[PDB]
Design a protein around this ligand. Structure first.
Ligand SMILES: *[C@@H]1O[C@H](CO)[C@@H](O)[C@H](O)[C@H]1NC(C)=O
Lengths: 49, 31
């Protein structure tokens, strides 16, 4: 079709690095925080759940 | 990608943004 802006950005020496944590790992961290705060309350942040 | 030179001198290189079917001028594909 037409040349994209991403190709013009990359082709002139400007790259974009990917983040270290993917969206699935952020979702797993959020799931762990929800499971802790539902099952245990505030006790999982002060030590053992 | 190397560890410290006091430990070892083995080197692993990463070509960023391209697949390794065009890099020549243990192969692993990464995002
Ligand atoms: C470039 O790499 C992608 C991801 O591995 C692959 O799907 C694609 O076929 C490669 N292009 C080639 C081999 O021309």
């Amino acid at each position: 079709a037409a040349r994209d802006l991403i190709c013009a950005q990359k082709f002139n020496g400007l790259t974009v690095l990917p983040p270290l944590l993917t969206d699935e790992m952020i979702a797993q961290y959020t799931s762990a925080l929800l499971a802790g705060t539902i099952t245990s309350g505030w006790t999982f942040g002060a030590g053992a759940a | 990608i190397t560890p410290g030179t006091n430990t070892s001198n083995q080197v692993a290189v990463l070509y960023q943004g391209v697949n390794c079917t065009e890099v020549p001028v243990n192969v692993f594909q990464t995002r």
